[PDB]
Amino acid sequence: SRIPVVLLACGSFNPITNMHLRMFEVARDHLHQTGMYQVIQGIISPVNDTYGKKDLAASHHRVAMARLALQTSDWIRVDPWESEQAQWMETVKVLRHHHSKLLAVPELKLLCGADVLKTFQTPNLWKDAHIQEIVEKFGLVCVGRVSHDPKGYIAESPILRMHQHNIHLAKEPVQNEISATYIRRALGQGQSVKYLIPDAVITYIKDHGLYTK
Amino acid sequence: SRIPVVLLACGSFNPITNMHLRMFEVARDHLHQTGMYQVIQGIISPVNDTYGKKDLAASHHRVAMARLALQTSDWIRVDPWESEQAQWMETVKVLRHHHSKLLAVPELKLLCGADVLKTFQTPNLWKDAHIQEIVEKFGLVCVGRVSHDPKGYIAESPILRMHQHNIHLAKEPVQNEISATYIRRALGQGQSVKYLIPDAVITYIKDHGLYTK
Amino acid sequence: SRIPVVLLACGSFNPITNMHLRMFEVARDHLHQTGMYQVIQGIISPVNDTYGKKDLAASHHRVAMARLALQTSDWIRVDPWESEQAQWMETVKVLRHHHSKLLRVPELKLLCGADVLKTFQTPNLWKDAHIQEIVEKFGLVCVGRVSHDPKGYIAESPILRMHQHNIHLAKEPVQNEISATYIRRALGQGQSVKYLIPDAVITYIKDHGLYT
Amino acid sequence: SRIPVVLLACGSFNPITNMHLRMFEVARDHLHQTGMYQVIQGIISPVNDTYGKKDLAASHHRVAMARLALQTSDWIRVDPWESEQAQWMETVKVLRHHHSKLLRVPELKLLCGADVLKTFQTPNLWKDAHIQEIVEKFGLVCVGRVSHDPKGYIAESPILRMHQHNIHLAKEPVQNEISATYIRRALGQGQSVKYLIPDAVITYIKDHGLYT
Ligand SMILES: NC(=O)c1ccc[n+]([C@@H]2O[C@H](COP(=O)([O-])OP(=O)(O)OC[C@H]3O[C@@H](n4cnc5c(N)ncnc54)[C@H](O)[C@@H]3O)[C@@H](O)[C@H]2O)c1
Ligand SMILES: NC(=O)c1ccc[n+]([C@@H]2O[C@H](COP(=O)([O-])OP(=O)(O)OC[C@H]3O[C@@H](n4cnc5c(N)ncnc54)[C@H](O)[C@@H]3O)[C@@H](O)[C@H]2O)c1
Ligand SMILES: NC(=O)c1ccc[n+]([C@@H]2O[C@H](COP(=O)([O-])OP(=O)(O)OC[C@H]3O[C@@H](n4cnc5c(N)ncnc54)[C@H](O)[C@@H]3O)[C@@H](O)[C@H]2O)c1
Ligand SMILES: NC(=O)c1ccc[n+]([C@@H]2O[C@H](COP(=O)([O-])OP(=O)(O)OC[C@H]3O[C@@H](n4cnc5c(N)ncnc54)[C@H](O)[C@@H]3O)[C@@H](O)[C@H]2O)c1
């Protein structure tokens, strides 16, 4: 029969957008189309507030916006564990945690856009051993993005190439490069972002006065 | 003070998508940003069933899907008058009708994507006199689309150039080229189109068995 | 053995751009990849000056620019026959013309971007009999373009879906949406279009005062 | 009178492509449009071979390809200084080097795509003092790219927003997203990349067996 799969998306979700959500749907249809997997759940894990140089809305709000965005989803939920930790946590550790949570066990795979695959090449960003454990022990489902060539990223990285069977490249013939950075700027200018991010998220942002100049 | 404006979008809406909806929002913010207009309403007018060579879902359903898509909009409504006529009607006639309906009168403008502006150049598609009345007596608000250069379309058409003050070019720094043709194909294959078109529209399509192979 | 193929691209080429050229390369690689064909020649056929409601550069200029653009190509050539006819000609007639020449046998296929497939749906634009002859007698090689879904255009066309064996969809893994309308506007504003169209074409345009 | 400007693009150029070249043309036109500057020179500075976790073609090859790509440019040149250093150098040091040479005065500005602005946010990638020196001592000219919002990157950076007078956002009205990674993969598969990168660069690549 089919191997059960849980998809984990780690990211900022500042705020969660229709594209972040579309990523799950495209990935699920892709895995199902292979004939060997059955996606039983998706998890949105917002990053901790201590992360990066960029100023993010409080994780309390990013978790809230995801929960509200996911109310019309019957298979994707937000998990705040990662954001509730005292500090930022390398992605491989978040995978380990959720794998333990599942502990005939479904395979847990990291879901991301092709741009993340490119960041694996950034000096000192990801430890080689972590890249290895991510693709070998968990798996990667990557959704295409304009200007990125995942196939080449895989061919040019010895670690990815060696475990390419555990990397699933998905993509849809659509162009949807709405950036959350633009969303925040537009919101700051009083412009509409309706139909780019969920109606429920816009309501929360308005009610809590988020992303103001 | 500001000139009141009603935006009319004529099209197939087979089915209405998040991009069709985004078009209204981008256009409204653009007109408001000029400082001289106040958009008070938007109208989605699905095309008649006798139109074109392409097979469209019944207008009864396209009107229903738009109504449901617009339930969370406080300023855009669907108007079935055009689709209820015995036969297809040139766009200038639909504008005339809605102008009469409004009859200190707000300006009624045709809302469309830049690709429509390009179709004005198609032999025998639009009567020169209609193109003229559309831009001169009503107005055009055009939203940018990848691969189209509205500014050049305007410069190269003597009629548009002469009335360019009545043509408003809007666009947002986003890439969103999701085609309804892809939506229908995906739906026909059992794939998800969630987050590309409204949740309410997907529910109607599923409940009424639309767009099946 | 592989089937010999000649690719014919009909269009304005006002002016020819790197995108138009790229279309040939992608189509050829796709056809060779199928293992069933051997593309032996490419033909750029600029449209006549009476065509449409547009002020196009004179046909002899568009032919000359295409020729310059193709100097570094060892398999694509421009053919002025079509532009040199007294009047505009439906595309199927251009295919028939070039088919006859080939006979004086390779298969002749129309080469176009996905957007062209969408124009097949435009009321009164293409005669149904002509769409049928194109995909039934000849063939169609389509290069993808952003915002277009060729697979859906084919499936929804009662004529195209019955001839898929003669339709070849070559996907463009790169994003190359450079509009010739934009090229003309930029040129008219005195802005650079270098690296968007061939250097020799830019020079010709300058020398002859085109698009000013 | 207009302020003399020299544009410096640091990058892999593995290999140089039509997009990299287009970036210079768009930036120059944008700067001239402001009416305040006169771009007098463009400089392509390929990165050293010790840089990053990537198997890059040898620096002398990337320099040679850039030189060939630029033969038809009357204002852009490749400078191998950087690639010829014993080790990789932070970009601000390359700017200082080229600034000194200019002195042996024109303003030297870093030229990059919008994506570079986003990398400024990457933990430990760029020293804050360096980002400050780049936009405060020199200048930054950014060319738009699909999926990136430079205006937001600037507004959200406590360093960039304080130096907007020295940041110039040049918008790319065309869609030109051709990945050098894709170019390399296509080449390795024996597929054409003609019209995506200069002909002379393709020839050099073939002659020297690069990307096989
Ligand atoms: N463990 C490590 O060493 C290490 C190093 C760097 C980053 N990280 C992790 O990586 C994450 C960084 O997330 P982020 O700030 O980029 O998240 P984000 O909110 O910007 O995006 C979330 C996800 O959406 C995808 N996405 C966004 N727009 C898309 C589109 N249009 N199409 C397809 N996919 C799209 C992104 O690729 C990403 O996978 C964090 O969880 C961080 O902890 C880990
Ligand atoms: N009066 C005439 O002579 C004449 C001739 C031809 C067509 N028409 C009219 O034109 C309409 C044709 O509509 P259609 O079939 O193209 O409608 P459609 O459903 O495909 O699209 C509706 C609108 O959405 C815009 N749009 C779609 N995707 C977009 C995106 N990603 N970004 C921005 N805008 C986007 C389109 O430009 C269009 O204005 C009909 O109302 C028809 O009656 C009139
Ligand atoms: N026989 C008929 O009934 C009929 C009806 C309408 C048009 N036509 C013919 O169709 C042609 C119309 O040509 P045009 O004005 O669009 O020519 P054009 O110069 O704009 O483009 C020529 C070709 O390039 C392709 N192309 C352009 N940019 C591209 C990109 N970025 N990526 C991929 N492909 C790209 C186009 O799809 C087209 O196939 C003429 O030859 C005309 O006679 C025939
Ligand atoms: N000093 C530091 O701390 C530091 C840290 C990281 C990187 N760097 C430097 O940054 C550079 C990294 O270069 P790279 O590997 O990205 O080079 P690259 O060859 O990929 O590209 C070079 C330039 O082209 C631009 N570009 C590419 N495709 C484009 C397109 N389609 N449209 C517009 N612009 C486009 C890129 O944005 C970039 O500015 C190196 O010089 C490196 O030393 C410096």
What brief labels describe this structure?
homotetramer; 213 residues; alpha/beta; Rossmann fold; 6-stranded parallel sheet; 10 helices; 6 strands; binds nicotinamide-adenine-dinucleotide
Give a written overview of the molecule:
Chains C, D: Keywords: ATP-binding, Magnesium, Mitochondrion, NAD, Nucleotide-binding, Nucleotidyltransferase, Pyridine nucleotide biosynthesis, Transferase. Chains C, D: It is an enzyme of class 2 (transferase). 4 copies of one chain form a homotetramer. Chain A has 213 residues and is α/β, with parallel strands linked by helices. Chain A has 10 helices and 6 strands, in the order βαβαβααβααβααβαα. Chain A binds chain B through residues 18-19, 21-22, 25-26, 28-29, 72-73, 146, 172-179, 182, 186, 191-192, 194-196, 199, and chain B through 18-19, 21-22, 25-26, 28-29, 72-73, 146, 172-179, 182, 186, 191-192, 194-196, 199. One nicotinamide-adenine-dinucleotide (NAD) is lined by residues 9-13, 19-20, 23, 47, 51, 90-92, 112-113, 115-116, 125-126, 130, 143, 145, 176-177, 180 of chain A.
Can you lay out the helices and strands and say which pair or pack?
The structure is a homotetramer.
Chain A: E1 3-11, H1 18-34, E2 37-46, H2 59-69, E3 76-78, H3 81-84, H4 91-102, E4 107-113, H5 114-119, H6 128-138, E5 140-143, H7 150-156, H8 158-162, E6 167-170, H9 180-188, H10 199-207
Parallel strand pairs in A: 1-2, 1-4, 2-3, 4-5, 5-6
Protein name (chains C, D): Nicotinamide/nicotinic acid mononucleotide adenylyltransferase 3
Keywords (chains C, D): ATP-binding, Magnesium, Mitochondrion, NAD, Nucleotide-binding, Nucleotidyltransferase, Pyridine nucleotide biosynthesis, Transferase
Enzyme class (chains C, D): transferase
